[PDB]
Design a protein around this ligand. Structure first.
Ligand SMILES: *[C@@H]1O[C@H](CO)[C@@H](O)[C@H](O)[C@H]1NC(C)=O
Ligand SMILES: *[C@@H]1O[C@H](CO)[C@@H](O)[C@H](O)[C@H]1NC(C)=O
Lengths: 281, 632, 651
């Protein structure tokens, strides 16, 4: 319905350039500020904001004095249309007499964060945006088929670059990620790190806001697109995101049972065949 | 209610012409237009206004430049995206596409940045943001992105309008990712002076500094500045323009009087030639002077006695001094006037038989008036005459040409060597008069005497030297004027544009300027030749050029660059060249000009602390409840 | 009694045909003289520096206009390239008439000239006026001759960077007479202006150039324009005019910007120090893409008082306006800055270049002045008053007051009548009111006892069109009419273009057809003889209707309003088979530039054409030698002749 803004400006630049300030603030994608609230702000005796203008998500505020201590002005905005993508926005403060001298700051929605989700190891960083949980066990569902589209998924669309059946050892957390530390039971495919092999320690991260459930001590089939961060001990490191394949492998009893009977054998037949044959003949 | 959406009931992007070609200047082709031409241009995708150059060049009608045509392209519904100059990798930035609606209807548009390899973008790039733009209004559709790529990524912003109103636009534009670290530059300055042994060869080291990023950009530039003196010069010259032209007088009387007229007339013509003052005189004066020289040459050969000797009247016994003086005049006149060479060859041969056993020469019947000889009564007359005949013989030596004169030259040059030996011996022996020493040194320097002889004559004159009253050394007697002229020519011959020569010329020029010119006889003939020779000598010597040869071995292997700021005409010329290299450059400096060499090494250095938001500050907090779709 | 006259330009251009005039005075009805004229005399023997051209003259064909080639090979071979000190050369006419008739000691008569290797016209243009570092600069140079036709001679071009150092050098032979080239700006280059220079290979003096700027920029989407109501402000205490400005901001595709213009004010000095007012800043929202703002007299006086400054101190300086507009809601912001608003003491300005000096005692003096808005355009219909004091001819001084309004293009032309034996003329000019613009001019009269004078009277003061015939009225003043003819010639671009003769009559009128060769400025020189003394006068005529000899007309057939990616039929029209050089600039580049540079245009071409004009001042002189030298000529009659000038400078 509505949202509430608080804008504060100040300066430490008494040593530096002096001058009045123009605050250019950009609202959330669907919100426009109420003119009635802003004009009431503009008519106050000690207003601070001595002039204003708005259209759409944009508010210009002229401050004819900038003090060392915080000078804050609040106002409100009403939502034209739903927000379609969870994202920050920016506010930019220009000196009236030196627009080259400025301060530009990102801010976020109240539930959301200041910056985009990104994974970093040493000198390399990698995008972490996207909905993590494939979380797919086909054996106990009606969607499982004997068609044998697992290879078609891996090779053609959406196409897979790495593939392992992995034993999850621990579930940890770092920054905005939950980190599954794993040991490779068998290698099925690689693109990066052709020298990957069984019994190597690996890291499979998942974004902390994602609700993926992966149990330590169990063995999962994990396939997806190559990362770019790598572990601190040198091993290439992976991130679970959209189009990654996450599937729990069944027992003999949970293959022998009627619901997935012989379909589980087809899954096993693919798993060995793809790991030896490779994607293309 | 008010938050209703139209999700995926919109134009499907495939049917949206995507805008991608954004040049800053185009249509640079040159076309042959036979009176009429039509070019079917395909417009670029940038909505601006174009100004079109037009220059028409033709063989028959020459250059015509047309009044520029203004051509502006406008879409009525469009998206505009200003990308920054460059954005650092792994540093979040806000992309701010703006939708513009110039229709009379409100438009509802779904905007998203297409998923691209190399950019990290809100929700993975699949999510799209509906926005509504009033009629005649615009609205920003800011997107926040952080770039992962190391070089460049093309990003496409897509705006899908309603199916009710199929408005739509798309902008594909290439984002430049700044290299790791930040640019830094070091300039190494070395003053240049290849004159003598100082900085002819040197070796310059690179940047040891481990602050450099190894795989970043690396460029190095070499450039050099040369500086000539800014002085306004001390040289004087330009003895009166019109006084020298008043010496041109047609020979009237017999031989000696003819020579009294002809010798300044030739000397004035040679001075006016050598000093280039014809432009400041009546234009046909040179023609008159040359006709006077031609008249003089025709006149004098009617008084020429038995193969090459002269007296004013044929009955009189030939004068050695006049014959030498006539030889000196007519050997120089040979340049202007194509006289007979063999007659001059005979005249020099006659002087050879006036030499004694050694180098000494004598005159068995001098000229009637001593004014020709400079008042050479008494003193070192025999020594001065011996030098004077040697000077005349040296001028005559140039006449010898072709096989017939090859032996004739040989006897004269051997005689010149014997004369040179005597002249150096006389200078060595002791205290001659200043007049005798100056003419002896002049004669020796003309004949390129060995330094054993030439130097002693030069040094003895310095010991004799006495200041005339201003500066240097020899109103004033004719002897002082004549002696200074010999000394000035000797100094110029021994050392070109000598510092001592400058002072002597200044005094002699002042002496020449009494009431518009010299009125005396023998001195003027020598002085005009000396002053003109000085003026040529001062302007002849011009130092130009500096040559810096650079070589190094590196990433690009063996490489060598030679750059010279000469080119014959230095147009205040300074020059810069690129020379990327390793960490050592070998410098070889040639030429002859003062200068400054700058080697500029530019590379990426570690980023260091942030500058922004250290003076100005802004802070913003937001509270409330935001309506979201597809958050989960 | 009889005379040989030799006329030529005072400066010889090597590789350029030199127009030489030759003429006979008081030569018997049947007498005939024949000879040869040629260029001569480095101090290398007396070698000719040109071929010879022969003239044949009769009593009934007593003048001839000759084309003397001066080629590079002969100038090189004679020794002008080895010459010391100044570049000076002789023109020489050779005829036995000087021997046979005048009994000189020569058969030669000449003139002493200067020379230059500067020749042709070199033009050059660039891909853009402003580039980013690391961007490819395309450019091309055009090589034309003195005749203004494409030249194939080898040219040398060099690129000089922002620091000032040569970065590149090319010397190339031109088959098509255009050199197209490209280079890339160093990525680390400092912002600043770059300069491209071009010469002919043989032309060490053939300077020509164009400049561009390098700057880091992102291409704007709108341009903001600060336009004063009048580009001057009166600081006279009688009435400080009110400061008001129409501030505009417009998208480069034409539509008006919507947003807020944040404007600041101050005083800017000559050095470049701008002292801003603290206070008086104006914030205004655009309406129809415009905002009208003004600075009140009370606000301004208080602001000056705030700076402890008086209105009497404002004889210099200028009122500085800088506006930073932020687009709403887009958020793009670009700045405009106005440095044209000088504080002035008069709204008008007087230009007295047109007024001739050294005017004939006993003939009307023509006071010509251009009245212009101070830092603006010519003032139309402004009343100008001229106060002319004729200083004592022995009688008491007198003052002549004549008033006239500016006819057009600021032109006022007032005929103040000057009587004989004026000691000197003192002129005071006052134009317009309120606050008159004033200028004062003093000019000395010819020395006493002259041989005679020549009145050149121009009835039509309008600049004649190319193709219009101009009529000039020639009247002898001050001496008996023994002569039966007066002789005249037309000098253009430093060359004698036409020479002819008109017999004396009552109110003699000579017709000058203004052809394309006389554009843009020419000198009319005419003379007659009184006994053995030449009498001459000269008048400058500007031709301001200049246009192409042929044409180039670019057009787009249609109503414009094209959309992106559409087909545009660009139409090119011309009068010959021509090489048409095209280029389409985004106009944002003009807005981006810190110092905008005008493109290459026809006015620059005509200005380049007249750089060879040796003429100095509006003409006239105290003596015929001065008149000829002022026109740009060198002259000799055998007794009176012209010393070489101090190059083109005319100090
Ligand atoms: C169009 O937008 C204007 C401006 O808010 C509004 O008054 C009008 O009701 C809108 N019309 C429609 C059909 O949404
Ligand atoms: C010719 O151009 C050069 C380079 O800018 C300059 O040094 C020289 O003074 C110029 N000469 C003239 C006569 O303008």
């Amino acid at each position: 319905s509505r949202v509430h803004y608080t804008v504060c400006i100040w300066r430490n630049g008494k040593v530096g350039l002096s001058g009045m300030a123009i605050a250019d603030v950009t609202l959330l994608s669907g919100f426009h500020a109420l003119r009635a609230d802003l004009e009431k702000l503009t008519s106050l005796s000690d207003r601070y904001v001595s002039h204003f203008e708005t259209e759409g998500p944009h508010v210009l505020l002229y401050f004819d004095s900038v003090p060392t201590s915080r000078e804050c002005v609040g106002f409100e905005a009403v939502q034209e249309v739903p927000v379609g993508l969870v994202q920050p926005a920016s506010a930019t403060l220009y000196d009236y007499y030196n627009p080259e001298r400025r301060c530009s700051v990102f801010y976020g929605a109240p539930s959301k964060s200041r910056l985009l989700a990104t994974l970093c190891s040493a000198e390399v960083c990698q995008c972490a945006e996207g909905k993590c949980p494939r979380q797919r066990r086909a054996l106990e569902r009606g969607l499982q088929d004997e068609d044998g589209y697992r290879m078609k998924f891996a090779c053609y669309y959406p196409r897979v670059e790495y593939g392992f059946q992995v034993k999850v050892l621990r579930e940890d957390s770092r920054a905005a990620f939950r980190l599954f530390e794993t040991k490779i039971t068998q290698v099925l495919h690689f693109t990066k790190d052709v020298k990957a092999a069984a019994n190597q320690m690996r890291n499979f991260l998942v974004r902390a806001s994602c609700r993926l459930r992966l149990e330590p001590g169990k063995e999962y089939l994990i396939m997806g697109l190559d990362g770019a961060t790598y572990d601190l001990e040198g091993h290439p490191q992976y991130l679970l995101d959209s189009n990654s394949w996450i599937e729990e492998m069944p027992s003999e009893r949970l293959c022998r049972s009627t619901r997935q009977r012989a379909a589980c054998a087809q899954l096993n037949d693919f798993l060995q065949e793809y790991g030896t044959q490779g994607c293309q003949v | 209610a008010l938050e209703i959406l139209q999700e995926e009931d919109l134009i499907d992007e495939d049917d949206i012409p995507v805008r991608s070609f954004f040049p800053e200047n185009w249509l640079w082709r040159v076309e042959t237009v036979d009176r009429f031409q039509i070019l079917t241009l395909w417009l670029p995708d940038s909505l601006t206004t174009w100004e079109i150059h037009g220059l028409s060049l033709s063989k028959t009608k020459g250059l015509c430049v047309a009044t520029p045509v203004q051509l502006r392209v406008f879409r009525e519904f469009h998206l505009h995206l200003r990308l920054p100059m460059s954005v650092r990798r792994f540093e979040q930035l806000e992309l701010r596409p703006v939708l513009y609606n110039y229709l009379d209807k409100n438009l509802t548009v779904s905007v998203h940045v297409s998923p691209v390899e190399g950019l990290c973008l809100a929700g993975g790039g699949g999510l799209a943001q509906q926005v509504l733009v009033p009629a005649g209004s615009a609205r920003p559709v800011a997107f926040s992105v952080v770039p992962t790529a190391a070089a460049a990524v093309s990003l496409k912003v897509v705006a899908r309008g309603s199916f009710e109103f199929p408005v739509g636009d798309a902008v594909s534009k290439v984002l430049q990712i700044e290299k790791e670290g930040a640019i830094h530059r070091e300039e190494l300055v070395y003053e240049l002076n290849p004159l003598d042994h100082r900085g002819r060869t040197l070796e310059i080291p690179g940047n040891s500094d481990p602050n450099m990023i190894p795989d970043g950009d690396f460029n190095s530039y070499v450039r050099v500045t040369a500086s000539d003196p800014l002085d306004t010069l001390g040289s004087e010259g330009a003895l009166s323009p019109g006084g020298v032209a008043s010496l041109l007088r047609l020979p009237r009387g017999c031989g000696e009087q003819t020579m009294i007229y002809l010798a300044p007339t030739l000397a004035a013509s040679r001075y006016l030639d050598k000093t280039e003052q014809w432009s400041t005189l009546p234009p046909e004066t040179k023609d008159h002077a040359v006709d006077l020289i031609q008249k003089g040459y025709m006149r004098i050969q009617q008084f020429r006695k038995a193969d090459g000797s002269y007296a004013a009247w044929l009955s009189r016994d030939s004068s050695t001094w006049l014959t030498a003086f006539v030889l000196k005049v007519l050997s120089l006149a040979q340049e202007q006037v194509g006289g007979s060479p063999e007659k001059l060859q005979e005249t020099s041969n006659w002087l050879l038989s006036q030499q004694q056993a050694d180098g000494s020469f004598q005159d068995p019947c001098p000229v009637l008036d001593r004014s020709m000889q400079g008042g050479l009564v008494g003193n070192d007359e025999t020594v001065a005459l011996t030098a004077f005949v040697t000077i005349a013989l040296h001028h005559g030596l140039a006449v010898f040409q072709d096989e017939g004169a090859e032996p004739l030259k040989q006897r004269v040059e051997a005689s010149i060597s014997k004369a040179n030996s005597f002249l150096g011996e006389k200078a060595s022996a002791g205290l001659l008069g200043a007049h005798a020493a100056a003419i002896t040194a002049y004669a020796l320097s003309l004949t390129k005497a060995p330094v054993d002889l030439l130097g002693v004559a030069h040094n003895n004159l310095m010991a004799m030297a006495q200041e005339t009253g201003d500066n240097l050394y020899w109103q004033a007697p004719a002897l002082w004027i004549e002696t200074t002229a010999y000394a000035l020519l000797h100094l110029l011959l021994h050392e070109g544009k000598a510092e001592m020569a400058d002072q002597a010329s200044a005094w002699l020029t002042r002496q020449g300027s009494f009431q518009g010119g010299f009125r005396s006889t023998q001195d003027t003939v020598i002085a005009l030749d000396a002053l003109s020779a000085y003026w040529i000598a001062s302007h002849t010597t011009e130092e130009r050029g500096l040559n810096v040869t650079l070589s190094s071995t590196g990433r690009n292997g063996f490489k060598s660059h030679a750059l010279q700021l000469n080119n014959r005409q230095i147009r205040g010329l300074e020059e810069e060249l690129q020379f990327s290299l390793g960490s050592k450059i070998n410098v070889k400096v040639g030429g002859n000009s003062k200068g400054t060499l700058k080697v500029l090494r530019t590379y990426n250095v570690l980023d260091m602390k942030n500058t922004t938001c250290q003076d100005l500050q802004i802070e913003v907090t937001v509270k409330g409840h935001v309506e979201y779709t597809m958050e989960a | 009694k009889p005379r040989l006259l030799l006329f030529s330009p005072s400066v010889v251009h090597l590789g350029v045909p030199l127009s030489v005039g030759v003429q006979l005075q008081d030569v018997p009805r049947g007498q005939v003289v024949k000879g040869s004229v040629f260029l001569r005399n480095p101090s290398r023997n007396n070698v000719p520096c040109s071929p010879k051209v022969d003239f044949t003259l009769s009593s009934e064909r007593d003048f001839a206009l000759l084309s003397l080639q001066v080629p590079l090979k002969d100038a090189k071979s004679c020794g002008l390239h080895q010459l010391l000190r100044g570049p000076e050369v002789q023109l020489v006419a050779h005829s036995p008439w000087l021997k046979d008739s005048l009994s000189r000691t020569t058969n030669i008569q000449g003139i002493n000239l200067l020379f230059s290797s500067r020749r042709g016209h070199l033009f050059l243009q660039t891909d853009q006026p402003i580039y980013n570092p690391g961007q490819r600069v395309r450019y091309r140079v055009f090589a034309l001759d003195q005749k203004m036709r494409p030249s194939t001679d080898t040219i040398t071009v060099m690129v000089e960077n922002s620091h000032g150092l040569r970065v590149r050098k090319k010397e190339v032979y031109m088959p098509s007479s255009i050199f197209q080239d490209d280079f890339v700006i160093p990525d680390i280059s400092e912002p600043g202006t770059w300069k491209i220079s071009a010469r002919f290979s043989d032309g060490l003096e053939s300077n020509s150039s164009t400049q561009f700027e390098v700057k880091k920029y992102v291409l704007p989407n709108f341009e903001v324009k600060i336009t004063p109501g009048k580009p001057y402000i009166l600081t006279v205490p009688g009435h400080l005019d009110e400061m008001q400005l129409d501030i505009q901001a417009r998208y480069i595709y034409g539509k008006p910007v919507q947003g807020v213009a944040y404007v600041r004010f101050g005083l800017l000095d000559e050095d470049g120090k701008k002292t801003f007012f603290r206070g008086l800043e104006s914030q205004t929202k655009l309406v129809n893409g415009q905002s009208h703002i003004s600075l009140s007299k009370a606000e301004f006086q208080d602001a000056l008082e705030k700076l402890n400054m008086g209105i009497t101190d404002l004889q210099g300086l200028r009122l500085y306006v800088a506006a930073a507009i932020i687009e709403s809601p887009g958020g793009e912001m670009e700045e405009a800055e106005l440095t044209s608003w000088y504080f002035v003491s008069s709204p008008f300005s007087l230009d007295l270049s047109k007024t001739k000096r050294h005017l004939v005692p006993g003939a009307p003096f023509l006071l010509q002045a251009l009245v212009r808005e101070m830092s603006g355009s010519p003032a139309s219909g402004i009343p100008v008053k001229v106060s002319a004091t004729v200083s004592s001819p022995g009688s008491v001084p007198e003052v002549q007051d004549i008033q006239q309004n500016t006819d057009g293009s600021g032109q006022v032309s007032i005929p103040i009548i000057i009587p004989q034996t004026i000691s000197e003329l003192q002129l005071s000019v006052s134009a317009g009111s309120p606050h008159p613009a004033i200028a004062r001019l003093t000019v000395a009269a010819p020395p006493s006892g002259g041989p005679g004078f020549l009145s050149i009277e121009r009835p039509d003061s309008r600049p004649p069109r190319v193709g219009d015939t101009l009529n000039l009225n020639l009247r002898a003043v001050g001496s008996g009419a023994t002569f039966s003819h007066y002789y005249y010639m037309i000098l253009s671009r430093g060359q004698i273009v036409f020479m002819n003769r008109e017999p004396k009559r009552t109110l003699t009128s000579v017709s000058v057809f203004v052809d394309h060769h006389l554009a843009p400025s020419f000198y009319f020189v005419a003379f007659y003889y009184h006994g053995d003394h030449p009498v001459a006068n000269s008048l400058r005529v500007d031709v301001q209707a200049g246009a192409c000899e042929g044409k180039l007309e670019l057009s787009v057939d249609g109503a414009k309003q094209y959309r992106n990616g559409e087909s545009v039929k660009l139409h090119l029209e011309t009068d010959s088979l021509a090489l048409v050089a095209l280029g389409a600039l985004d106009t944002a580049l003009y807005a981006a530039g810190s110092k905008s540079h005008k493109p290459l245009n026809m006015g620059k071409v005509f200005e380049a054409m007249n750089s060879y004009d040796l003429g100095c001042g509006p003409g006239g002189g105290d003596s015929a030698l001065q008149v000829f030298q002022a026109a740009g000529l060198a002259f000799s009659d055998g007794d009176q002749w012209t010393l070489s000038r101090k190059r083109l400078s005319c100090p």
